[PDB]
């Protein structure tokens, strides 16, 4: 029964969606929590990184895809690599072929097709990892939500990962405030830190845990990692 | 659990142990529990266990469970329901009442791998007993007993028959005693000669020992 | 001329191949190979559905293999001639038939 | 194998379930058709039912013009009818170029038959 | 299953016995309907009327009927 | 008297309207239907999940009209002895006519709703005959709403061309997978029963719950209450639900090992 | 084309096909290997259910990869042939490219590698045979015995047995070998191999086959009488009394 | 599904035999008899024509 | 994304029988009567042409086909299987014995190509 | 006052079972849930009342039968002073028209009269389980039993007195109506025990046996393949068989290792 | 049957979890990284007097600055190593410098997710994830001595101490307390020997245990049976003198 | 005149039961005076452990019908009733081929 509709990717169920899509969706939440916010001039991503142990250390999950483009993941590390590699080729071609910095809208639609295609086989699979893809081109800053189902929505702020809603409600409140803070790297970073804390309810907020990433009007893709987020706490 | 071939060790071993301990030996026909009705298999199975506990001590020998079994891939299936029903009652009856020594169960099947691995259940069935093949020396031993009960000629040599036999189980050895002895009964004689045995050894040997070139390597 | 021992191996490897890879059925066939070399004299092989092949100096395959072979083992003798072998084959053939007498 | 309710093979009754059910629903367009021959002509008369008044009738056809001379009436469900029409029209067009000659009814028939088998 | 001609006849009788606006069009309904039987055609008469109780009147309109017939049509083949 | 209310359910609103139109509006304004000359149903069919709020609303309609509620369970009718069930149904209807306003509530309509389609109906003739007997009776009268019969299935797998007709099972009401707005309302019904500390953020929880049926929602609430007990509280807070959803009781789980 | 899977990972951790492969080794032939200081002997018992064969037009159970490398097996004939074919191409290939015959270690890696690979891809399942690979490296005299199994695992052993009734003869080796003294006498290495197979074959001393590999293309099948001579000697040992 | 039509009957068993192979050995016993005699002067081949 | 299937549709059964082939033996039985007589002085083949609507014609049907000019063939079993097989059989006979030769194929040799085709379709899923 | 009765039922009743937990190492999790759902509402109803919740009516315990799953059921009944009622689900399914439905009503009424009691259903695979036939003249009969059983649960029943604890060997072929809340609220998972788990369950059996004193079960656990609680007990008694076989009073680590080696191979399929 | 696209209701595939069970059916493998050097230790094991444990090894060289210890199905890691070496050599050709331990772990992990029955974006050249886990340790002159845990899942973690295998829970706990970055190369080895003996069900001697080290003066060097033995005596004597 | 030649239901299973009984008699009581005779036309009701000596010990062929045999039977049945002496059972027997008793 269950095993019919999990064991095949070239199926559908009576609800209007296959069970595998419900599990992939669950898997994004199984990621660690990350928020994204923009005012449409700059876009910031603030991310809580957990590491397995005191004897592990942090490994990167904010990915420079170009010097004007990046992503954060939440969900499955193996899959995230596959997607990141794709977006990176895609960024490179856009520069070589068109002199473009690539809009999110164009990138999302292309990532969608590949995903679709691998549900059009046995032994291909949805990614089961979500991404907040940011970049600063000529229509400004942009924040997209990509899901491995192929749903692409641009949101002004959002969250993915466990307890998305905590930051999201804070974001729907502070909305009107942040969108009129235009042109400020530092005001928005401060916001991101404030936001991520409304997600938390079973996790600690510490310097080494937190990680910030920016691209914006006068900033090409630069990451603050480790030490360098202390002064925004 | 005893698994081999019936009346070669599997039937016999359970019969022996029953004689030693003065226990009632209860021979349970696996198949008759395969009734074509519903409700019917489990209450037949239950009745067998009821009577076993009442009239302890007893060894319960359940002959050739595979007709009520068949593992499948699922623990209930859209095929026949009656075969699945008797199987789950049988699994619940080991799993749910345990005995020290008052009732002992001997289960029989030709292939132990057609049984569900949870119907085997460690902590009741601890022993899993399998069947070795006779070597030359065992053939001599098994033969010696069967001839004690015969009367025969003294030109019959045990050693000679045994060497030329190769890969016969004890069942074939028993058949030989009867077949050579049958030629004596045809010649109206209650000895058996050397000659009867040779022809007998050869014939059962031939039929058992069919070649298909699946040996060798 | 091809050696027998090689030619047999190429068939057996092929049979073997189908059941390992391709999802295929294997062939349901046994061959008894009769061939000559000046490195070995006459050679006689048999190959069977598992991809296993062996040499025999007298062999039976098909219905009633066991029984034929048992008769073969007694009547066999180190000394040979063709016309003697023709008699041998026929004596046996008559006694392995699953139908009365022989024609 | 062990399957015949998920894949298509010979029946032991000898009447193939997939072929029989294909014989049955075709009628899901509410059609009835005939074709007759006159001495010099061949006429087809065919039903049409229009199930909405958001629909134009003049784009609703069950006759597809294969070439210039050849006609084909499909009785079936229309996504399958059209699928065959697309394939038939090209094979007809391909034949006409290669062989210098307009496709026979029977040859078109035979070729689509052998493919369905 | 009834003719086209048969649908028109069965509709006539079932909306006859129901109260209605003075202008009415049986024919309109008849085209849209396929795969119905007499019980299905009666239901269409009654379906239109439930929405007329809703609309605070005794009178089916051709307008109720157009909805009624398409809904009965949607819920099945 | 069932004590069910429409305040015990919510966000099933569009489906509340259809049921009320089908059985209550004929009862109350019988002279209006009569005078029009349209047949008024005497059966309704509901399908969907029971306990989401399909079953609750039936009981609620009966209470509101102050009809006699009679629960007849379909496996009960199915006797191994020669027609008991057909007989039970004619008595079921006769007593129903006497008792009016009445809702004859039939749990399960796939238990008798198999009847086979081959020559296999021979065996299972008790189940075909009982189902046929209620439909012949329903069509044997019209334009009255003295008896209502309302049918419920655990999971729909049965529907027939025979069920159709207005005096038979006219109404086909679907009760869906709840929308987001609706889950929050169901939670706020459920949490009425809870002792709250009034810190619970309704909006957030409703979005986070995805693929939950009304009964499953109830399961989160008892779990949250259960956590609160271990924590040493007599009331619950918002965090207690967030924690609650993640837990296994509805096929939703969490995991780790996908991150560094 | 085709590439649907036949290898499916077990919740055991030990794949189905590997575990069912090992069964195939137990049914098959019996092979044992003993190393000297100067030899490596590979013994096989012959089991002919009926014999109408000759021993010279049957394929023999110790098979040459090279003039000075042998491979010996237990399991099915069919599978082992495939492993052999691939190894004879590899033998020649090293000879062509490095200008030197194979090292034994590389060859062992190779036979393992094909097995391991058929566990890992779909569409192929792995082989029903375990092998004894022995030989000598260029400029060398020290014996090498390695054991390869269908899991694709290999390791070195001073003595080993595989195939039918492995247990009995393993124990027999545990009490009849020395690690401060692998025998440097060719005669005692053959002796031990004959004792081992004797205890299993049932009858017949010309249903025992020894193959001796000494350095520098010396692969030698010892003849009937020589074999009889150790068997005589083993009954003198067994019917010893003081 | 493609693998949901597959049965994998080409693989080693729990007894370590190959289903389809064992079945082929059977086939050969239901077909005619074939006998091969090798002598050092010739080879005599017979195969039995049934039906 | 498809054409990755090659698992067989003809398998061994526990009586070592072949599933499809048992099924197909019926199909032949449900056919109509066809015969052959070799007189040594020729060959005669005859069959019943029968058809599946009264409005159809069996005068404009054919159940003997020319394979090559000098050879004709007839069958019992199913109409669809016969048409595709005759076409493939007509193809190989032209290509391999009139482009490589010029004499029309000996009979037996043509039988061996038809046989190879049918068995090939049984091996391969 | 004669309203609601046992009628005539066929059942196996054990007032206060003689069985206590003997697996706590892999069934730490089934015990934590169990305690809370059954033991504490019976021991203090008032707590639940103050929260504003009433506990689960039915709980499903799944995974392999008898690996401490069965033990946990008997154990909680003893601990609460409630009647333990073992019904074998497969016996309550009958061919006979309704014979099956009738049997089911009488059991729940019986339960009501005698309330504060645990109905343990061994096997719901029988009672429901897979199909595709959707009645067939033998999967109708089964469906009729399944459906009647649902009717009592989803109707009017006490959730604070009557517990039903269900046992299965696979919940993936069971109908969504058997699974869903409104009938089974908590569904608890069996865990094959971890190395540390094996040690505690071992430690229990080795409150008997003259094992060497200084034994490290953790070391033995690391060489072990996977095992279930049934298997860990199984090893211990088989090790004692080696001690008698060799005619010696005391047990070593070694006797336990030798028993592992044997039992796992024997198991497999 | 089964497929390989199947998720669990969590959303984590079946085969991946089953791969973690296989790692635990390996033997304990311990790596500790300290200021100077990385130490890697394995149990060679010796189960028979006839087994040559002193002719085999379980600590394999990737490059002249990168080693690895494995636990699991040790054949499955031959494919992985072979691929890593090919990558490692290719970087020495392409830039003339050391290959980062991290850049490599990433490369290797990409092909651990390459299991499937064919899909339209990627090559599949395995059916199933490897039965085998790695500890890869190395040195580069960009971030010095490092240790990484390479999963068959394809996740990659940076560490300082890690144990894998059956006893990894007990060994890792002890390690957390002992780990300091003020421990000399020799010290790290001695503390590794003490723990490795504990988790062992049999006596610790050279004939069943192997040490190996990574120094930036001479790279990955697999330590001799003799040198490791000498310290085992010294461990035995100190330990039996605080008792 | 007798329906059912054995089937997949209860005729083959019942045939197993009988064999069991026979084992038991040579067991405790070692008295055995009641013998069971099986008759069959088909080898698909049989399995090799069933033919294995100690369940079924003798497999006896029942007379396949020959011309000489057919005359004999006829002569015995004719020796009850009024038939002419001018008849030749050799003719009547030779006329019949593919006829049982």
| Neighboring chains of A (3 or more beta-carbon pairs < 8 A) | F, H, I, J, K
Q: Which two tokens stand for residue D108?
A: 């078109």
Cα angle at G15 between G9 and G20, to 5 degrees? 140
Query: What residues contact F236, with CB distance under 8 A and at least 6 apart?
Result: F191, F194, F195, F196, F197, F200, F224, F225, F227, F228, J51
Give the domain ranges of chain G. 1-240
Radius of gyration of chain F from its Cα atoms, rounded to whole angstroms: 22
Question: Residue K10's beta-bridge partner residues?
Answer: none
* Distance, first Cα to last Cα, chain C: 36
F218 is in an annotated binding site: no
Closest CA to J79 of J31, J121, J126, J124: J31
- Cα(B174)–Cα(L54) distance, integer angstroms: 9
Query: What residues contact D40, with CB distance under 8 A and at least 6 apart?
Result: none
Q: Where are the beta strands (DSSP E) in F39-113?
A: 43-47, 68-73, 102-107
Q: Which two tokens stand for residue F30?
A: 């019988």
Q: Which two tokens stand for residue K126?
A: 């395995």
Interface test with H, best of G1, G2, G3, G6 (most H CBs within 10 A): G6
Resolution value (Å, 1 decimal): 7.7
Question: Residue K31's beta-bridge partner residues?
Answer: K40, K162
Method: cryo-EM
Neighbours of L101 (CB within 10 A): 9
Chains D and I touch (3+ CB pairs under 8 A): yes
Backbone angles phi, psi at E12, to 5 degrees: -60, -45
Query: Count of domains in chain A?
Result: 1
CB J217 within 8 A of CB J209: no
Contact flag E53-F32 (C-beta cutoff 8 Å)? yes
Q: Which two tokens stand for residue K85?
A: 């070496």
- Cα(F83)–Cα(F77) distance, integer angstroms: 9
CB F207 within 8 A of CB F180: yes
| Neighboring chains of D (3 or more beta-carbon pairs < 8 A) | E, H, I
- Cα(F182)–Cα(D4) distance, integer angstroms: 45
Cα angle at E24 between E23 and E26, to 5 degrees? 160
Classified as helix, coil or strand, G87 is helix
Classified as helix, coil or strand, E38 is helix
| Neighboring chains of K (3 or more beta-carbon pairs < 8 A) | A, F, G, H, I, J
Contact flag I11-D1 (C-beta cutoff 8 Å)? yes
Question: Residue G208's beta-bridge partner residues?
Answer: G45
Query: What residues contact B100, with CB distance under 8 A and at least 6 apart?
Result: none
- Cα(C33)–Cα(F142) distance, integer angstroms: 88
- Cα(B196)–Cα(B176) distance, integer angstroms: 10
CB K146 within 8 A of CB K99: no
- Chain D residue with minimal CA distance to E35? D30
Question: Residue K211's beta-bridge partner residues?
Answer: K41
Classified as helix, coil or strand, J140 is coil
| Contact map slice: H 4-33 vs K, CB within 8 A | 4, 6-8
CB K7 within 8 A of CB A20: yes
Length of chain A: 233
Cα distances (angstroms) measured from residue A121 to each of A16, H2, I1: 19, 10, 6
Backbone angles phi, psi at B97, to 5 degrees: -135, 135
Classified as helix, coil or strand, J2 is coil
Backbone angles phi, psi at E27, to 5 degrees: -60, -40
- Chain J residue with minimal CA distance to F226? J36
Residue K149: burial class (beta carbons within 10 Å; 0-12, 13-18, 19+) = buried
Residue with tokens 């040493």: F232
- Cα(B117)–Cα(B94) distance, integer angstroms: 13
CB C47 within 8 A of CB C33: yes
Classified as helix, coil or strand, E9 is helix
CB J14 within 8 A of CB J118: no
Query: What residues contact J205, with CB distance under 8 A and at least 6 apart?
Result: J22, J232, J233, J236
CB J120 within 8 A of CB J19: no
Q: What b-and-e string marks burial along D3-25, b requiring 16 or more CB atoms within 10 Å of the CB?
A: eeeeeebbeeebebeeeeeeeee
Sort out which chain H residues have CB atoms less than 8 A from I4's CB and list them: 2
Contact flag K28-J196 (C-beta cutoff 8 Å)? no
Sort out which chain A residues have CB atoms less than 8 A from K176's CB and list them: 53-55
Q: Does I6 touch chain G (CB under 8 A)?
A: yes
Q: Which two tokens stand for residue G64?
A: 């040459």
Q: Does I7 touch chain G (CB under 8 A)?
A: yes
Query: Breaks in chain D follow which residues, C to N over 2.5 Å?
Result: none
C-alpha torsion sign, points G153, G158, G163, G169: negative
* Strand J162-167 with J117-122, pairing: parallel
| CATH class held by domain G1-240 | alpha beta
Sort out which chain H residues have CB atoms less than 8 A from D4's CB and list them: none
Residue A70 belongs to domain spanning: 3-233
CATH number for A36: 3.60.20.10
The minimal CB distance from J51 to the residues F219, F234, F250 is found for: F234
- Cα(I14)–Cα(L20) distance, integer angstroms: 27
3-state secondary structure chain A: CHHHCCCCCCCCCCCCCCHHHHHHHHHHHCCCCEEEEECCCCEEEEEECCCCCCCEECCCCEEEEECCEEEEEEECHHHHHHHHHHHHHHHHHHHHHHCCCCCHHHHHHHHHHHHHHCCCCCCCCCCCEEEEEEEEECCEEEEEEECCCCCCECCCEEEECCCHHHHHHHHHHHHHHHCCCCCCHHHHHHHHHHHHCCCCCCCCCCCCCEEEEEEECCEEEEEEEHHHHHHHC
CB G17 within 8 A of CB C20: no
Q: Own/partner pairs for B158-166, CB < 8 Å, 24+ apart?
A: B161/B197, B161/B198, B161/B201, B162/B136, B163/B136, B163/G203, B164/B201, B164/B205, B165/B139, B165/B201, B165/B205, B166/G202
Cα distances (angstroms) measured from residue G155 to each of G72, G131, G159, G193: 16, 12, 12, 21
Neighbours of G198 (CB within 10 A): 18
| Contact map slice: F 152-191 vs E, CB within 8 A | 161, 164-166, 168, 170, 172
- Chain C residue with minimal CA distance to H46? C89
Closest CA to B173 of B140, B149, B211: B140
Per DSSP, helices labelled H in chain J are 28-34, 40-43, 45-51, 69-80, 89-92, 99-113, 141-154, 176-179, 195-205, 217-223, 229-245, 253-267
Q: Which two tokens stand for residue G71?
A: 């491979």
| Torsion region of F199: left, alpha or beta (phi above 0 gives left; psi -120 to 50 gives alpha) | alpha
Domains of chain K as residue ranges with CATH: 1-242 (3.60.20.10)
Closest CA to G210 of G39, G27, G28, G68: G39
The string of DSSP letters for D68-116 reads SS-EEE--S-HHHHHHHHHHHHHHHHHHHHHSSSPPPHHHHHHHHHHHH
Q: What is the four-CA torsion angle of G48, G52, G54, G55, rounded to 10 degrees?
A: 10
Contact flag G49-B216 (C-beta cutoff 8 Å)? yes
CB G138 within 8 A of CB G94: no
- Alpha-carbon gap: I30 to the closest alpha carbon of chain K (Å): 36
Q: How many CA atoms lie within 13 A of J262 on its CB side?
A: 21
């Amino acid at each position: 029964f269950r095993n019919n509709y999990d064991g095949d990717t070239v199926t559908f169920s009576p609800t209007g969606r296959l069970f595998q899509v419900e599990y992939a969706l669950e898997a994004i939440k199984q990621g660690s929590v990350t928020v994204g916010l923009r005012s449409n001039t700059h876009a910031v991503l603030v991310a809580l990184k957990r590491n397995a142990d005191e004897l592990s250390s942090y490994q990167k999950k904010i990915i420079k895809c170009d010097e004007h483009m990046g992503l954060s993941l939440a969900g499955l590390a193996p899959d995230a690599r596959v997607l990141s590699n794709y977006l990176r080729q895609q960024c490179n071609y856009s520069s070589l072929v068109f002199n473009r910095k690539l809009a999110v809208e164009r990138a999302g639609h292309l990532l969608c097709d590949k995903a679709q295609k691998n549900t059009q086989s046995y032994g291909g699979r949805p990614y089961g990892v979500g991404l907040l893809i940011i970049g600063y081109d000529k229509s400004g800053a942009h924040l997209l939500e990509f899901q491995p189902s192929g749903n692409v929505t641009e949101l002004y702020g959002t969250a993915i990962g466990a307890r998305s809603q905590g930051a999201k409600t804070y974001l729907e409140r502070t909305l009107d405030t942040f969108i009129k803070i235009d042109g400020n790297p530092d005001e928005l970073i401060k916001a991101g830190v404030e936001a991520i804390s409304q997600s938390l309810r079973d996790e600690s907020l510490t310097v080494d845990n937190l990680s910030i990433a920016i691209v914006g009007k006068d900033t090409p893709f630069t990451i603050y990692d480790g030490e360098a987020v202390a002064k925004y706490i | 659990i005893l698994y081999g071939a019936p009346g070669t060790g599997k039937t016999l071993l359970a019969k022996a142990v029953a004689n030693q301990t003065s226990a009632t030996f209860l021979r349970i026909v696996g198949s008759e529990l395969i009734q074509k009705y519903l409700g019917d298999g489990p209450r037949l199975c239950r009745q067998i266990f009821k009577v076993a506990g009442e009239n302890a001590p007893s060894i319960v020998f359940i002959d050739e469970i595979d007709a009520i079994g068949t593992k499948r891939y699922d623990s209930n299936s859209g095929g026949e329901r009656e075969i699945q029903r008797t199987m789950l009652e049988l699994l619940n009856q080991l799993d749910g009442f345990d005995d020290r020594g008052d009732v002992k169960v001997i289960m029989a099947t030709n292939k132990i791998e057609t049984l569900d691995p949870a119907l085997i259940r460690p902590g009741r069935i601890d022993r899993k007993i399998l069947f070795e093949n006779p070597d030359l020396s065992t053939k001599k031993k098994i033969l010696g007993i069967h001839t004690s009960k015969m009367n025969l000629s003294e030109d019959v040599n045990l050693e000679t028959l045994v060497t030329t036999k190769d890969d016969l189980s004890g069942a074939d050895i028993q058949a030989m005693c009867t077949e050579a002895g049958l030629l004596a009964l045809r010649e109206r004689r209650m000895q058996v000669t050397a000659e009867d045995f040779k022809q007998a050894k050869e014939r059962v040997m031939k039929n058992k020992v069919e070649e298909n070139l699946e040996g060798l390597y | 001329d091809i050696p027998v021992e090689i030619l047999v191996r190429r068939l057996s490897d092929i049979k073997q191949g189908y059941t390992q890879h391709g999802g295929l059925r294997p062939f349901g066939v046994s061959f008894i190979y009769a061939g000559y070399d000046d490195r070995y004299g006459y050679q006689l092989y048999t190959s069977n559905p598992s991809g296993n092949y062996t040499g025999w100096k007298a062999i039976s395959v098909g219905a009633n293999t066991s029984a034929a072979q048992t008769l073969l083992q007694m009547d066999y003798k180190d000394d040979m001639k063709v016309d003697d072998a023709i008699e041998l084959a026929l004596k046996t053939l008559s006694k392995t038939t699953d139908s009365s007498a022989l024609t | 194998a062990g399957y015949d309710r998920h894949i298509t093979i010979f029946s032991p009754e000898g009447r193939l379930y997939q072929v029989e059910y294909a014989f049955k629903a075709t009628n899901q367009t509410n059609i009835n058709s005939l074709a007759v021959r006159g001495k010099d002509c061949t006429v087809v008369i065919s039903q049409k039912k229009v199930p909405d008044k958001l629909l134009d009738p003049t784009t609703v056809s069950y006759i597809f013009c294969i070439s210039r001379t050849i006609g084909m009436v499909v009785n079936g469900p229309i996504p399958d009818a059209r699928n065959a029409a697309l394939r038939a029209k090209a094979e007809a067009a391909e034949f006409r170029y290669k062989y210098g000659y307009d496709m026979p009814c029977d040859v078109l028939a035979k070729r689509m038959a052998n493919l369905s088998q | 299953l009834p003719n086209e001609a048969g649908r028109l006849e069965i509709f006539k009788i079932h909306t006859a016995k129901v109260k209605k606006t003075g202008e009415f069009d049986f024919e309109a309904a008849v085209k849209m309907s396929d795969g119905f039987n007499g019980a299905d055609i009666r239901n269409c008469a009654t379906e239109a009327g439930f929405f007329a109780i809703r609309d605070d009147r005794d009178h089916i309109n051709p307008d109720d009927l157009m909805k009624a017939v398409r809904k009965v049509a949607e819920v099945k083949k | 008297k069932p004590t069910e209310t429409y305040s015990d359910v919510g966000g099933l609103d569009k489906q509340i309207e259809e049921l009320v139109e089908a059985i209550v509006l004929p009862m109350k304004r019988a002279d209006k239907f009569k005078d029009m000359g349209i047949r008024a149903p005497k059966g309704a069919l509901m399908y969907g999940p029971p306990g989401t709020g399909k079953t609750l609303l039936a009981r609620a309609c009966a209470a509101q009209t102050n009809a006699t509620f009679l629960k007849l369970a379909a496996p009960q009718l199915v006797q191994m002895y020669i027609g008991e069930g057909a007989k039970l149904v004619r008595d079921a209807f006769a007593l129903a006519k006497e008792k009016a306003p009445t809702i004859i509530f039939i749990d399960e309509l796939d238990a008798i709703g198999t009847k086979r389609f081959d020559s296999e109906k021979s065996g299972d003739r008790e189940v075909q005959r009982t189902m046929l007997e209620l439909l012949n009776q329903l069509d044997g009268f019209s334009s009255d709403d003295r008896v209502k019969v309302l049918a419920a299935t655990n999971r729909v797998d049965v529907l027939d061309p025979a069920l159709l007709r207005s005096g038979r099972l006219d109404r086909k009401i679907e009760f869906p997978l709840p929308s987001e707005d609706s889950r929050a309302q169901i939670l706020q019904i459920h949490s009425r029963k809870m002792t709250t500390d009034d810190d619970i953020n309704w909006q957030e929880l409703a979005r986070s719950t995805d693929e939950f049926n009304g009964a499953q929602l109830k399961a989160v609430t008892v779990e949250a209450g259960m956590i609160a007990l271990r924590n040493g509280q007599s009331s619950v807070k918002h965090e207690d639900f967030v924690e609650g959803i993640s837990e296994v009781q509805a096929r939703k789980s969490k995991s780790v090992s996908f991150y560094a | 084309g085709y590439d649907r899977a036949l290898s499916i990972f077990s919740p055991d951790g030990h794949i189905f096909q590997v575990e069912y492969a090992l069964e195939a080794v137990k049914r098959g032939t019996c092979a044992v290997g003993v190393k000297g200081k100067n030899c490596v002997v590979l013994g096989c018992e012959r089991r002919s259910t009926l014999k109408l064969q000759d021993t010279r037009i049957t394929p023999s159970k110790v098979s040459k990869i090279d003039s000075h490398v042998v491979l010996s097996f237990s399991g099915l004939n069919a599978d082992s042939r495939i492993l052999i074919e691939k190894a004879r191409v590899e033998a020649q290939s090293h000879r062509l490219t490095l200008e030197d015959p194979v090292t034994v270690e590389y060859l062992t890696r190779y036979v393992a590698g094909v097995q391991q690979r058929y566990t890992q891809s779909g569409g192929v399942r792995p082989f029903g045979v375990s092998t004894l690979i022995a030989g000598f490296d260029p400029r060398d005299d020290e014996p090498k015995l390695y054991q390869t199994e269908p899991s694709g695992i290999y390791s070195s052993w001073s003595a080993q047995t595989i195939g039918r009734n492995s247990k009995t003869v393993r124990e027999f080796l545990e009490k009849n070998y020395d690690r401060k003294e692998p025998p440097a006498t060719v005669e005692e290495c053959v002796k031990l191999t004959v004792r081992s197979l004797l205890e299993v074959v049932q009858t017949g001393a010309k249903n025992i086959e020894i193959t001796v590999v000494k350095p520098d293309s010396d692969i030698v099948a010892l003849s009937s009488e020589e074999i009889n001579q150790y068997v005589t000697q083993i009954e003198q040992e067994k019917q010893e009394q003081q | 599904g493609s693998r949901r039509y597959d049965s994998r009957t080409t693989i080693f068993s729990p007894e370590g035999r190959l289903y389809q192979v064992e079945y082929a050995l059977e086939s050969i016993s239901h077909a005619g008899t074939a006998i091969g005699i090798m002598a050092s002067d010739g080879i005599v081949l017979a195969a039995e024509r049934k039906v | 994304m498809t054409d990755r299937y090659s698992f067989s549709l003809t398998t061994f059964s526990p009586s070592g029988k072949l599933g499809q082939i048992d099924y197909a033996l019926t199909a032949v039985k449900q056919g109509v009567t066809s015969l052959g007589i070799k007189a040594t002085n020729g060959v005669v083949i005859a069959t019943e042409k029968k058809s599946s609507s009264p409005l159809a014609m069996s005068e404009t049907l054919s159940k003997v086909s020319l394979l090559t000019p000098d050879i004709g063939a007839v069958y019992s079993g199913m109409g669809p299987d016969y048409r595709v097989l005759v076409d493939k059989s007509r193809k190989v006979a032209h290509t391999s014995y009139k482009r490589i030769y010029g004499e029309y194929p000996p009979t037996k040799l043509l039988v061996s190509e038809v046989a190879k085709i049918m068995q090939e379709a049984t091996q391969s899923g | 006052p004669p309203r609601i009765d046992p009628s005539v039922t066929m059942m196996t009743v054990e007032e206060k079972p003689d069985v206590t937990y003997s697996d706590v190492g892999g069934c730490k999790d089934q015990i934590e849930k169990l305690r809370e759902v059954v033991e504490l509402p019976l021991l203090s109803p008032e707590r639940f009342a103050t929260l504003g919740i009433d506990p689960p009516k039915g709980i499903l315990l799944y995974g392999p039968p008898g690996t401490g799953k069965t033990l946990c059921a008997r154990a909680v009944a003893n601990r609460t002073d409630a009647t333990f009622i073992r019904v074998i689900g497969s016996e309550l399914v009958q061919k006979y028209v309704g014979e099956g439905a009738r049997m089911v009503r009488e059991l729940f009424e019986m339960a009501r009269t005698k309330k504060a009691c645990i109905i343990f259903f061994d096997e719901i695979d029988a009672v429901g389980g897979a199909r595709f036939d959707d009645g067939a003249g033998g999967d109708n009969e089964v469906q009729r039993t399944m459906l009647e059983l649902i009717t009592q649960l989803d109707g009017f029943d006490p959730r604070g007195n009557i517990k039903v604890m269900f046992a299965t060997n696979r919940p993936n072929t069971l109908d969504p109506a058997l699974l869903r809340p409104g009938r089974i609220d908590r569904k608890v998972e069996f865990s094959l025990p971890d190395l540390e788990g094996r040690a505690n369950i071992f430690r229990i059996h080795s409150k008997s046996m003259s094992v060497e004193r200084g034994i490290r079960w953790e070391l033995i656990s690391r060489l072990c393949p996977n095992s279930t609680g049934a298997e860990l007990r199984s090893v211990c008694t088989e090790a004692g068989m080696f001690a008698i076989r060799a005619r010696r009073k005391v047990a070593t680590e070694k006797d336990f290792l030798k028993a592992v080696d044997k039992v796992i191979s024997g198991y497999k399929k | 049957d089964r497929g390989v696209s199947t998720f669990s209701p969590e959303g984590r595939l079946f085969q991946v979890e089953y791969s973690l069970e296989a790692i635990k059916l390996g033997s304990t493998a311990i790596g500790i990284a300290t200021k100077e050097g990385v130490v890697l230790g394995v149990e060679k094991r010796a189960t028979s007097p006839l087994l040559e444990s002193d002719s085999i090894e379980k600590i394999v060289e990737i490059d002249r600055h990168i080693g690895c210890a494995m636990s699991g199905l040790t054949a499955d890691a031959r494919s992985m190593i072979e691929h890593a070496r090919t990558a490692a050599v290719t970087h020495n050709l392409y830039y003339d410098e050391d290959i980062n331990v991290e850049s490599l772990t990433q490369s290797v992990c990409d092909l651990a997710l390459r299991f499937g029955e064919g899909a339209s974006g990627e090559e599949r050249l395995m059916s199933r994830p490897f039965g085998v886990a790695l500890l890869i340790a190395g040195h580069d002159a960009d971030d010095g001595y490092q240790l990484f845990h390479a999963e068959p899942s394809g996740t990659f973690y940076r560490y300082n101490a890690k144990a894998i295998g059956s006893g990894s829970e007990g060994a890792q706990a002890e390690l957390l307390n002992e780990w300091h970055s003020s421990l000399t190369l020799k010290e790290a080895e001695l503390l590794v020997l003490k723990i490795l003996k504990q988790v062992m069900e049999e006596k610790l001697d050279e004939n069943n245990a192997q040490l190996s080290c990574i120094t930036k003066q001479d790279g990955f060097k697999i330590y001799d049976n003799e040198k490791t033995a000498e310290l085992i005596k010294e461990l035995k004597e100190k330990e039996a003198a605080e008792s | 005149s007798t329906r059912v030649e054995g089937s997949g239901g209860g005729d083959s299973e019942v045939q197993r039961t009988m064999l069991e009984l026979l084992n038991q008699l040579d067991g405790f009581e070692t008295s055995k005076n009641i013998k069971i005779i099986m008759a069959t036309n088909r080898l698909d009701i049989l399995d090799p452990a069933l033919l294995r000596p100690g369940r079924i010990d003798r497999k006896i062929e029942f007379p396949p019908p020959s011309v000489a045999a057919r005359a004999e039977i006829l002569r015995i049945h004719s020796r009850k009733m009024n038939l002419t002496r001018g008849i030749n059972l050799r003719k009547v027997a030779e006329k019949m081929n593919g006829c049982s008793g």
